Amino acid sequence: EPEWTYPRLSCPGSTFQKALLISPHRFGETKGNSAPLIIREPFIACGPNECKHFALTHYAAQPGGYYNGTRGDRNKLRHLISVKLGKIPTVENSIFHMAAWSGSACHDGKEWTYIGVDGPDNNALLKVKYGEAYTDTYHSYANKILRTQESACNCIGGNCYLMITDGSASGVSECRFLKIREGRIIKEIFPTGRVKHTEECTCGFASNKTIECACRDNSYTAKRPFVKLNVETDTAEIRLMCTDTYLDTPRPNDGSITGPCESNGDKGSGGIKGGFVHQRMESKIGRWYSRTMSKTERMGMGLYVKYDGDPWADSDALAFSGVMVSMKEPGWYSFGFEIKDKKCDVPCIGIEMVHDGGKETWHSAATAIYCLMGSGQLLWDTVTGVDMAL
Amino acid sequence: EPEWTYPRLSCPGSTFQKALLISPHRFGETKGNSAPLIIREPFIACGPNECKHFALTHYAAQPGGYYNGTRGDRNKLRHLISVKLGKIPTVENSIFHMAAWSGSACHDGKEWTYIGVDGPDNNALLKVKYGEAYTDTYHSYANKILRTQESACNCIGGNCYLMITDGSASGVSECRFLKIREGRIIKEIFPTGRVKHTEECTCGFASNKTIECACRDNSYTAKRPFVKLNVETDTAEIRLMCTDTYLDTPRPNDGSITGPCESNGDKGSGGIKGGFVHQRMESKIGRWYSRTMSKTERMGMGLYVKYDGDPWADSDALAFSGVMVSMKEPGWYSFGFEIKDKKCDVPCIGIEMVHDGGKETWHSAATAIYCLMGSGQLLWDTVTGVDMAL
Amino acid sequence: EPEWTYPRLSCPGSTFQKALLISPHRFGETKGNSAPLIIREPFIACGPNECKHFALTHYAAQPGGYYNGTRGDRNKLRHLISVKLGKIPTVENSIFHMAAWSGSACHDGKEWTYIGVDGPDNNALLKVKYGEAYTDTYHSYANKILRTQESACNCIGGNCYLMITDGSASGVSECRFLKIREGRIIKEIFPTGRVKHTEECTCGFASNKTIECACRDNSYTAKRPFVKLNVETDTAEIRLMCTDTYLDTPRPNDGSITGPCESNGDKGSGGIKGGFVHQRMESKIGRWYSRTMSKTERMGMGLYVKYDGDPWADSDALAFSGVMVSMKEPGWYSFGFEIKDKKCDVPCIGIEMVHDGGKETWHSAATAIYCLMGSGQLLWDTVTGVDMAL
Amino acid sequence: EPEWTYPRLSCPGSTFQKALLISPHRFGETKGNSAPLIIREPFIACGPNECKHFALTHYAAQPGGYYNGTRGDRNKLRHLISVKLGKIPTVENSIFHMAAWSGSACHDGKEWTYIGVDGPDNNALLKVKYGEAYTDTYHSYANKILRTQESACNCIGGNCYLMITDGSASGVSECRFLKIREGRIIKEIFPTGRVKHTEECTCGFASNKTIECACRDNSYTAKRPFVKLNVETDTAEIRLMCTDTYLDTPRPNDGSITGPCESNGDKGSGGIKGGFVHQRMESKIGRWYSRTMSKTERMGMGLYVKYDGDPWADSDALAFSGVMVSMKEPGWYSFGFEIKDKKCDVPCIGIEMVHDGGKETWHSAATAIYCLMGSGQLLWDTVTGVDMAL
Numbered sequence A, B, C, D: 001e002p003e004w005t006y007p008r009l010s011c012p013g014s015t016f017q018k019a020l021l022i023s024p025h026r027f028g029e030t031k032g033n034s035a036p037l038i039i040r041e042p043f044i045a046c047g048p049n050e051c052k053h054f055a056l057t058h059y060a061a062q063p064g065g066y067y068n069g070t071r072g073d074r075n076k077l078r079h080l081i082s083v084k085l086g087k088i089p090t091v092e093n094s095i096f097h098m099a100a101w102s103g104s105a106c107h108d109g110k111e112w113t114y115i116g117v118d119g120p121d122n123n124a125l126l127k128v129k130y131g132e133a134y135t136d137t138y139h140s141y142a143n144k145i146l147r148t149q150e151s152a153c154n155c156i157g158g159n160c161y162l163m164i165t166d167g168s169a170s171g172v173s174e175c176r177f178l179k180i181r182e183g184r185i186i187k188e189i190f191p192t193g194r195v196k197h198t199e200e201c202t203c204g205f206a207s208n209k210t211i212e213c214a215c216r217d218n219s220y221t222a223k224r225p226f227v228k229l230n231v232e233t234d235t236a237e238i239r240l241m242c243t244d245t246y247l248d249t250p251r252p253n254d255g256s257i258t259g260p261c262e263s264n265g266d267k268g269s270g271g272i273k274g275g276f277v278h279q280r281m282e283s284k285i286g287r288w289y290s291r292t293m294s295k296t297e298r299m300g301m302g303l304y305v306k307y308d309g310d311p312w313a314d315s316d317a318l319a320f321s322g323v324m325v326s327m328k329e330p331g332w333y334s335f336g337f338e339i340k341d342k343k344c345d346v347p348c349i350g351i352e353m354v355h356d357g358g359k360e361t362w363h364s365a366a367t368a369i370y371c372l373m374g375s376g377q378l379l380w381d382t383v384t385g386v387d388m389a390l
Ligand SMILES: *[C@@H]1O[C@H](CO)[C@@H](O[C@@H]2O[C@H](CO)[C@@H](O[C@@H]3O[C@H](CO[C@H]4O[C@H](CO)[C@@H](O)[C@H](O)[C@@H]4O)[C@@H](O)[C@H](O)[C@@H]3O)[C@H](O)[C@H]2NC(C)=O)[C@H](O)[C@H]1NC(C)=O
Pocket: B003, B006, B007, B008, B009, B207, B208, B280
């Protein structure tokens, strides 16, 4: 008799380590016999028995003849797909959940919820799937590419919370939260505070009372908007992270944005989804983040950590925890997720490593995983191993 | 231990939306490494735990060397196959249930019933398979291509009802209904009324007492024969759908078949299996239908709806719900089906999108799925994304 | 709490029909992207939940580079493999059970028993596998290719009975039966009567007290040795079938072997494994057989039936029940097996259809299935659909 | 609910036989359509319900374009992978557990423990995974390639014991033992005695009180270090195997290392992981070993056995049991493992058969399995059947 899931205390440990590389295009040469799917925006969500590796496919494999368009964001062909984590996401291994050029998913202890956005840019559509069944939708409210998290949503006691946003990518994008229960949207939550532009939130439980999200401002700042969501009152507030360690790409030099914590500063235009995940201890909360090694390119990926504090108020630099992806390798999207051990939760960060050779060739990604395990210092970086000319 | 299933009230909603595209020949290019099966006549049937995607394969894959003959209807190699819905129907993924060039399937709540017709045109044979066991057959009664629904049969209380027919494609084809229980035919039902040509019925539950079917007349009319089958007395009547919105292809202009409801009118020769699904509410019943956008060609697919009334007597046009497949794209067979959610049923329509390059190349199909989903208006159409020269 | 299996009454029906074709090399062209395994001697065995399709592979696929030797019988590479019945036995779908150039398998209600013979011709070795575990062996006793049934063994109340034989293929091959329980050989049974040459027995339950086998004499006669095994006393006796319808290939004209029932007659040299399966009714036993359409070649396959009687004594011709494989198509090995329906057993005959193009090319087989279903007459024959030049 | 597992008495038997060959590169020809993974260091571990086949992959398939580097030992792409035993380790079939260039695994009766070492040579990291959760790590203690067994670890009562080592391949490598429970290291065991070089131990249960291991010394001797680990006091001693039958490769002539048991002798530099498995009977213990047929090259593989005695003190030659792999074929790593039968344990030995074409082509391995099975003498050897030019 399956019960509702709740966030548990995190497992012991004080450092991340390289766990797993999922690099489908290691097998996509013309000399070869495999059919890895062309994908971007991967993320991982785990239930009580299984981990699922999600992505947005372009509905084409490599090698193949439909490369043209695979460097685009949205079209009528993109689908949310998944494999069990640890499987190579090929044509045959994958399962196609729904049409979607923006997605999310989560397990509530009883059943998977799948979330997909599709439709025309000026009138997109959020779709909710619970198990096999399509159960609810939510309409565009600003008529400017309604879109969601591109990472796991979060469930507590059967209630799943999901960030959505709608609005110009170079102007205002006031985000909303949806409270979804058993596939049906039972409440809209309208955040207060600094709501100018929030998107692609990476969200997790700081506790049984609070969800926290580190998001992307693609318009005004290289500081990440940081959401605190009270799950007991269904209220949310947004403020920019204050840390000198700006987590967006592009970004100016750390600590160079002058004025109070709310100051936007320079190099704010553009952005990237950033990894964020909680380490819940008896009396401390650990906050782990990732950002690219380069200040302007999607190259490299570093891990940072800060225990305790108010992310809205602490200007202190984050503690650099190690290089996950070298500056010589691609470092694009990253995301947090949690594996369920028998009695506690294991916090992890996944990294999207995009193979980018321009619009004249195929365009896809690998996925690297780092997880909290043991003590000491982070020891090894991840390479993709792929030569795009093969 | 599993109980029999019964139609339930539908889930809330007032519009369909694009749910899912299964386009396996996106992976069938010569530059690729995949092996999608060559198929036609796909449909979907759902049990308590799982949805299955069925089709009739020509026992060949693309790329391959057995294209010749795949634009034919019947031969000794055609088989009923399936995959879990969301998987691509490939050589390795598919399961082959039985030899068949006409098929159906349904879950009674305990077990799958598979239905496959094959044999010679003048003496074909319907075969029943219950799980893994072949359990029963039914013989041609007119010696002119015994054939069945090409979509899910319907179970209630362990009783599964199935349309069969026999007779000339261009003359009389009096259908019958088989009542089937745990794989064995226990009753034949002889419909009453307008009985001279009924084939390829798409059937569903109007309630716990009635099954309704919208069918194809390939010979006499562009109106669809409309079956009402009483499940409490095991009796059935057929009359032509009265609606001005003629659902066959080909068909004349809407409302142009003059005279009383049973008038056949012109452009009646030829036809196509149409989508039909029920939206069951407490105090009213919604009927959803699909037809091609072209009045003569198998191009496009539009969605229509009417609430309540009697389809035998009401001439009112169906309300246009939206374009599922634009007229630039192929729109062949369509079928109804329902997904079992936790406490209600989700009504859906699937669309066969045939890749037709003539008899000089391969001939197969993609499948699009639209489902009842939230409110508002239908928002996006479907394309297969397939170039047949690849 | 799984219980021991017993033979049950057969399901109703009075004729066989074409059920299923498994034709892996429909997908093995150079133009294609699949990897069907090169196999011969298929057979099927069913447990209470699943049907398994077994074969002896040459550990090579098509297309591939190891064709040379695939027209041989024995080597160090042959393995017993299986897939779930209904799956194409490819490199990836198959599972490799054990090294074997001769095999059998059966389910006892609790667990699969797998049986494989390998080793040098003059000192071969029967190996028994119960589930994952290798559990017992049995040595050559005549030092002339110890070999087994190439079809399902038979289990009652946890005891599995298996025919084995050892001896020259052009002289004496006194067979033995092994009683195997939970993977261990607990008794040898030495048949009496006509024991000169028995091999490749196709065996089944005539009742709870008796196993019957129709076997192959590759040396002295075109009559099939016919075994009756008393399961309650563990005693077996062998006599030639008496029917005018000689079931071996090659064979003289029916009814042309003069003298008493035991007379060997002409064209006795050579042979073929023949399908045989029981139809158990309340007071009748039905016996179904298959033999090639040609009297001298492995071409075509016909179905025969006789109700009741003593196969040792009745000279009456068997009743011809229909053409399963045309004389224009290959008809090699055939075998009986039974599917388990919910409350009764479904008798079936499988047919090996070998693609034979000589030693200069690849050498493999398809499998066709006919099962007892409904009434009337057998309606359609099976073709393989394969062009070996592709 | 599942109970912890404990070594049981072995099943009856007095000889090994050829059981199974896993030769995936039989499907790796350029004329083919398959994608076997490039792997080395395979081993097998069995739980209550299933046997798993593990290897270290170079994250590449054959045919492919990443052959370069697959004859190297360590890199950032190597992963621990597995399939169900009897499946071919291909891109689609394999599951990727974690990044590792050194590995182990074992089932405690409730769950799988996976072990993978990676990171830089001077600072490598052992990672523990319990089911799907990363649960613990252990750091290099000598900064000279921390590494582990390359074969199954051993569990008793929920306690899993694992050999690790660290130090120069050509100097001192003092191993340790990790006691692991539900994924977390709870004790380090520091062996006593002849401790200067111990690596790649093949371990099994001599009883409920003792684990024994036959290990590799790559530096000093051709005798195998022999670990006795007491599981009741968690203490361990290592001495050199005294037997005249030296089990390493390279090695001098048998019995030619003069002097007392702990004498190292000549040709000690270099080495190879050897097969070792226990045959536990009521009143006696059988120890089965394997070594290459060549005294210097990794060619061939022979089987040896001794009952009882003390391997630290007895100089008696082991009894030659037979040739598993002829000297014409490659014989690289060998490993012990046990299959769980219903009431007893089946001892087995696996053999890595490496396809070595030098560094100018691909580099990978097949796996042969021999098992305790009936009585008599071992009857057949194994060949891979693979031509590397294809
Ligand atoms: C067609 O007929 C079907 C069979 O009569 C109808 O299904 C029945 O629907 C009613 C209400 O919609 C259900 O009664 C409710 O039961 C729930 C609890 O559900 C379970 O209860 C126990 C477990 O405690 C279990 O034994 C049952 O089998 C249910 O799984 C209560 O909370 C409600 O208060 C109410 O009593 C019936 O259970 C259900 N029967 C079956 C066999 O499914 C169906 O509604 C009809 N379709 C229509 C009208 O369109």
